[PDB]
Design a protein around this ligand. Structure first.
Ligand SMILES: [Zn+2]
Ligand SMILES: [Zn+2]
Lengths: 154, 429, 718
């Protein structure tokens, strides 16, 4: 990545051989097999595009998504038909729903405001009803580009 | 809503150890311990006073192992497979790497004393350790969504800990063997001010207030400048490296030339136990040892490893070297009765080896306990550093605890129970 | 007894009765009392008192010195208890009312030593050890002992309560061999059962359930016909007083053809209809265990057992008491389902199983529960939704569910069920978020299922193709528990499916062996061990990854290494090879001459085992012995016979007896028979089959080690 050095410095001062860019020095340390963490994880620019066009033909190689941001199906799509595996094991250290229920009962907020993606269960797994943020009084929600009024009077 | 406790072992003794704790909703077994010196079913605790229900796994939730000494983790392979329990076992990280070795070694004494009637076989060692779920210090771990434990650092052995059990509003901290005087071996026990509802501690060295390294080195140096041999029994691990590192640093500072030996056989952790020694807090003069040169003329220091002078190496090498006046032996550890290491340390020098033969003794005998513990100073300082609501005493004796409780409830004005071997003790919150 | 120790008795008795010397030690007293138990009860116990008027001195001083330490008087009390076994010894010890003295107020009964539970436990054990004749029972009656025992069986130390209950049942079972003592025990039990103190009634129930079951004389049922109203009516209080003990009492009274002869089954049915869903389970299970039962009651029992699974399967896509607790929490629901699966599997291997034992419904419910717990089921109601939302991602439920679903192997049926169950086990293996304490049971169950399918079949290769890409991932999980369980499962296959060229197609087509071959360099030892045994049980078939290129790896792990387990497992693997038949001389030589100098003991033992196997396989005596000497078996034998470790010596003397008898049946033959017959074996066989502590556990040695107190010894971690 073109921000390798400062990245590692700011991780340290507060085996991995970082490089500034695939062009220049890097092309003299290429020993296969290898492992190559790269740029932006939406498979649409940066360097990962170059490898995903280099290793997209050998059924041996592998991509391993570790970012929940971009839905991975459509993301991988515009390189089809591809013959490499594509695992999807996302790492989200964020608060999950049982923990946020415990956190709410501990902190006891007088209200709650959460986007519409939460007070109703997720779309893909409609049968579950436990991943909705449960809190009393009911959690007022907001939709994209809306103007809510937190109902407090001075 | 109560909190029950029962020292099923360790009750006014330094033998068995098994503290069964019952927090408001769950049960937890602490320090499932053993007892040497016996040769039948009476060595393991009496678990039958738990099974008056459905079988275990429905009853308990997690077993905890303070450290690797055989009096706290030497009963799991009998408790995890024979009586039957498939539930998570929470150890520290170095104890999961050591306790297999110390167990697999104690088994050698057991199957050799012909007492394998109701015992744990080698397969059970692995099939028990596979139920371990290690924890990392200062990093709590959650089970049952309501039972969260947290580690600490107490020393006295690489890998020990003081565990903390929490169910939310109430909690119980348990301390294994800790050390408060910061000897340069591992460090001083550091616990945070969590102000818990219950604190349990050990009372090995109670009625007593660095000279050990001094006189040990002096005596070795004296008996080695006369063409005389040393003997120092030790387990396959444990107190062996806290002796090897001492000899090394004293020697390169004194530039001696006497062959030093430490022969475990069960593992070569003479260069591996140091690996785990680093993440908490490789040799020059030290070779390997075998039966060949345990007789050659010349000053010598030998570290054998059957244990407290049981059958194996130590007993044999010793039985050879008794008829000599300049040699000496040291026993840096407690000794269990019915073992020649208990005849020798207390008086007797007129022994009777295999058969009706007679062996004499003309060596020296020393007891310089290199164990790591605490005492009144450090115990008071730690119970102050903790601010508990009750303190319990285990792994000690009768009169020392009886004198200690007076001061404890006197100075800090805190209640201190002294439970015997098996009495229920309830403390409400 | 024995004179060699008799001469030590006076001095040790003196140091015992004198407290100026430091205190005694517990294990000393225990082993010494054990020696007394085995020396006295095996012969007369009066002549030993006559010849040695020294123990009587101790037993008289114990009630006089008034300052015995905590523990010496306990040994003395247990000693007076084990001495007064025979009536003659009872009368001899009664010289001076010594027994009513120390077992009465003159002894520790009243003095301020009633604090340490050890002395009380010793007192009770002694009383139980003496009451074996009607004279002692008359003593207990008139002098008065049960009066104090009643109070005693309420203290805070279970080690005393249990012993007290056992003492009650023993004095009872000896009484009626209605006497005053027996009638008082019966009246106390009755008047306690009608009380409302939970510990007291728990003691009543446990003394009753020992009395019944431990004795079956006619008075047992003549007394149970009296109690049956009092016991049965206990099921009137809203909380059952002593749930588990009540279950146990019912289960013990019921398993007898005597008491079954009307109210028994009826009150058991009332219980089954009344007991909550935490204690009714085991009761109904114990009922179904019984061969004899009015079949309607067995229907009731088995149905109230099957309640949870046939309840869950009305909350998915193919009474409310149990479904209430099913929706209470995550603890209670998991506990209920785990108890139900544990019971319902404990029932299967029994011949008294109901009829017809359901198999379709059971398996369907079980796979539904397992998949639900994985987190991919499909609810069909509010209860199904909340259940899928509470059980998701558990362990206890999932573990016990795998245990049941693998218990279903003895159940015969078409391959449809087999594929149904594999279609969920395959899913449970490659399920991200699966603890290492789950994959093990999962592999066990998958194995039992795959080995019970009636060449191979129409689905075996399909499932194997879908499975090995899971045995290739979970074989590199980052937690050595999985890295071991996977290898063990692969070994189970390599032992059960070595002659099925289609399975071999599946395996060689996969990339399992090219990973096991690499694991032998894993850091954690157990991994190396299981990897070596896996590659051993593999290469006895011819399934090598793309034999010597493993033999060298093995011998290298054997020569130098940092652990024991790999060496003592590679020796096992070598034994496997040499026994099966998978240059042989040089092989045995290069394994023995590099297994001998190893320091561990298990390795040398297994080496001797290898040598025994080789000898039996090779046994013309002249050249045979020349070959057997070339490897140097005689060197290793006469080198480690007088070995430090004893099991080595046991194996060696057994091998040498084998060799001696086998050469008797048929260096030079004369030379070898000489150098073998020069030493002794049978005396050596005895002194090695003996214990390692035969000397330091002998009575005389214990006496020496006891009466010589006053050196450096305090106690500390071992
Ligand atoms: Zn310790
Ligand atoms: Zn300890």
């Amino acid at each position: 990545s073109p921000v390798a050095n400062s990245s590692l410095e700011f991780s340290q001062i507060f085996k991995l051989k970082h490089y500034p860019s695939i062009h220049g020095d890097f092309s003299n340390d290429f020993r296969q097999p290898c492992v190559v963490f790269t740029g932006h994880p939406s498979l649409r620019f940066g360097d990962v595009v170059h490898f995903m066009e280099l290793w997209g033909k050998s059924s041996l190689n592998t991509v391993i998504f570790t970012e929940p941001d971009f839905s991975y199906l459509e993301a991988l799509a515009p390189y089809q038909p591809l013959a490499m595996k594509c695992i999807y094991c996302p790492i989200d250290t964020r608060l999950n729903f049982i923990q946020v229920s415990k956190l709410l009962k501990e902190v006891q907020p007088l209200h709650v405001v959460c986007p519409e993606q939460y007070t109703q269960p997720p779309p893909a797994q409609s049968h579950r009803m436990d991943l909705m943020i449960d809190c009393q009084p009911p959690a007022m929600s907001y939709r994209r580009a809306e103007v809510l009024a937190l109902p407090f009077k001075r | 809503p109560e909190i029950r406790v029962t020292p099923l072992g360790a009750g006014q003794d330094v033998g068995r150890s098994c503290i069964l704790v019952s927090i408001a909703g769950k049960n937890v077994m602490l320090d499932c311990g053993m007892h040497m010196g016996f040769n039948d079913d009476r060595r393991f605790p009496d678990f039958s006073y738990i099974t008056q229900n459905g079988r275990l796994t429905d009853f308990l939730d997690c077993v905890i192992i303070s450290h690797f000494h055989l009096d706290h983790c030497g009963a799991l392979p009998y408790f995890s497979e024979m009586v039957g329990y498939d539930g998570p076992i929470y150890m520290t990280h170095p104890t999961q790497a050591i306790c297999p070795i110390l167990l697999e070694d104690y088994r050698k004494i057991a199957v050799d004393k012909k007492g394998e009637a109701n015992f744990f076989t080698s397969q059970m060692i692995k099939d028990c350790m596979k139920k371990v779920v290690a924890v990392h210090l200062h990093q709590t771990v959650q089970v049952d969504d309501e039972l969260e434990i947290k580690a600490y650092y107490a020393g006295h052995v690489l890998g020990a800990a003081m565990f903390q059990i929490k169910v939310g509003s109430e909690s119980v901290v348990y301390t294994g063997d800790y050390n408060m005087t910061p000897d340069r071996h591992l460090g001083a026990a550091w616990i945070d001010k969590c102000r818990p509802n219950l604190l349990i501690t050990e009372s090995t060295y109670a009625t007593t207030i660095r000279c050990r390294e001094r006189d040990f080195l002096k005596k070795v140096h004296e008996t080695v400048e006369r063409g005389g041999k040393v003997l120092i029994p030790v387990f396959a691990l444990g107190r062996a490296q806290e002796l090897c590192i001492l000899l090394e640093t004293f020697w390169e500072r004194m530039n001696l030339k006497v062959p030093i030996y430490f022969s475990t056989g069960l593992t070569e952790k003479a260069n591996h136990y140091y690996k785990l020694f680093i993440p908490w807090t490789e040799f020059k003069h030290i070779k390997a040892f075998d039966r060949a040169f345990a007789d050659n003329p010349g000053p010598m220091v030998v570290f054998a490893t059957p244990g407290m002078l049981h059958a194996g190496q130590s007993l044999q090498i010793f039985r050879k070297w008794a008829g000599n006046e300049k040699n000496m032996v040291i026993m840096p550890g407690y000794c269990v009765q019915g073992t020649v290491g208990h005849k020798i340390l207390s008086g007797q020098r007129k022994l009777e080896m295999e058969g009706r033969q007679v062996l004499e003794v003309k060596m020296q005998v020393e007891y310089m306990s290199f164990s790591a513990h605490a005492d009144a100073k450090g115990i008071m300082q730690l119970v102050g550093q903790a601010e508990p609501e009750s303190v319990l005493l285990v792994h000690g004796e009768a009169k020392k605890m009886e004198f200690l409780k007076q001061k404890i409830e006197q100075e800090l004005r805190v209640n201190c129970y002294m439970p015997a071997n098996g009495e229920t003790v309830t403390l409400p919150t | 007894m024995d004179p060699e120790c008799a001469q030590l008795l006076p001095a040790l008795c003196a140091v015992l009765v004198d407290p100026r010397q430091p205190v005694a030690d517990d294990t000393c007293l225990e082993k010494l009392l054990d020696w007394f138990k085995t020396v006295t009860e095996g012969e007369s116990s009066v002549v030993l008192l006559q010849e040695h008027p020294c123990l009587v001195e101790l037993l008289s001083h114990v009630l006089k010195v008034q300052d015995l330490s905590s523990g010496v008087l306990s040994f003395s009390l247990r000693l007076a208890g084990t001495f007064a076994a025979q009536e003659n010894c009872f009368q001899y010890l009664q010289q001076g009312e010594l027994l009513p003295g120390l077992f009465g107020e003159p002894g520790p009964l009243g003095r301020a030593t009633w604090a340490v539970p050890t002395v009380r436990s010793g007192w009770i054990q002694g009383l139980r050890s003496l009451a074996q004749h009607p004279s002692a029972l008359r003593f207990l009656a008139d002098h008065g002992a049960v009066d104090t025992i009643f109070s005693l069986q309420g203290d805070s130390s279970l080690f005393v309560a249990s012993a007290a209950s056992q003492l009650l049942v023993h004095v009872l079972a000896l009484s009626m061999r209605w006497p005053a003592c027996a009638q008082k025990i019966m009246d106390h039990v009755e008047e306690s059962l009608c009380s409302a103190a939970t510990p007291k009634v728990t003691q009543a129930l446990n003394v009753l359930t020992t009395t019944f079951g431990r004795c079956q004389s006619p008075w047992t049922e003549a007394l149970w016909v009296r109690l049956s109203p009092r016991v049965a009516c206990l099921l009137e209080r809203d909380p059952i007083p002593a749930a588990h003990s009540f279950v146990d009492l019912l289960l013990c009274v019921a398993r007898s053809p005597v008491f079954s002869s009307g109210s028994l089954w009826e009150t058991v049915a009332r219980a089954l209809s009344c007991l909550g869903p935490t204690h009714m389970g085991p009761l109904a299970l114990g009922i179904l265990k019984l061969e004899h039962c009015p079949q309607a009651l067995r229907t009731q029992a088995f149905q109230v057992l099957l309640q949870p699974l046939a309840c869950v399967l009305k909350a998915t896509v193919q009474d409310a008491t149990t479904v209430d607790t099913l929706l209470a929490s995550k603890s209670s629901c998991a506990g209920l389902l785990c108890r139900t699966l544990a019971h319902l599997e404990e029932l299967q291997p029994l011949p008294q199983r109901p009829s017809p034992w359901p198999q379709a419904s059971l398996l369907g419910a079980t796979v539904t529960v397992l998949r639900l717990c994985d987190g991919s089921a499909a609810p069909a109601s509010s209860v199904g939704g909340h259940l899928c939302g509470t059980l998701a991602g558990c362990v206890r439920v999932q573990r016990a569910a795998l245990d049941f679903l693998g218990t279903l192997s003895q159940g015969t049926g078409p391959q449809e069920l087999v594929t149904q169950a594999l279609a969920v086990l395959l899913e449970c293996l490659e399920s991200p978020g699966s603890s290492p304490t789950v994959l093990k049971k999962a592999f066990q169950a998958t194995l039992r299922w795959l080995l019970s399918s009636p060449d191979l079949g129409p689905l075996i290769p399909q499932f194997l193709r879908e499975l090995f890409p899971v045995l290739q991932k979970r074989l590199c999980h980052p937690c050595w528990e999985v890295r071991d369980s996977a290898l063990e499962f692969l070994t189970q296959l390599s032992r059960h499916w070595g002659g099925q060229a289609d399975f071999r197609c599946a395996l060689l087509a996969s990339e399992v062996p090219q990973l096991a071959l690499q694991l032998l360099q894993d850091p954690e030892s157990y991994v190396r061990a299981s990897a070596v045994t896996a590659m051993g049980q593999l290469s006895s078939q011819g399934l090598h990854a793309p034999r010597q290129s493993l033999f060298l790896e093995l011998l290298h792990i054997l020569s130098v290494d940092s652990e024991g387990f790999p060496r003592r497992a590679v020796m096992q693997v070598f034994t496997e090879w040499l026994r099966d038949g998978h240059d042989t001389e040089q092989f045995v030589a290069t394994v023995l001459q590099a297994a001998s100098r190893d320091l561990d003991w298990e390795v040398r033992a297994q080496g001797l085992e290898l040598a025994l196997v080789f000898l039996g396989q090779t046994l013309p005596l002249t050249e045979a012995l020349r070959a057997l000497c070339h490897v140097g078996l005689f060197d290793f034998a006469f080198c480690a016979l007088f070995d430090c470790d004893r099991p080595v010596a046991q194996k060696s003397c057994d091998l040498l007896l084998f060799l001696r008898d086998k050469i008797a049946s048929y260096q030079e033959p004369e030379a070898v028979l000489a150098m073998l017959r020069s030493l002794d074996l049978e005396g050596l066989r005895s002194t090695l089959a003996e214990s390692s502590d035969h000397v330091e556990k002998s009575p005389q040695s214990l006496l020496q080690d006891m009466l010589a107190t006053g050196g450096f010894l305090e106690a500390d971690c071992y």
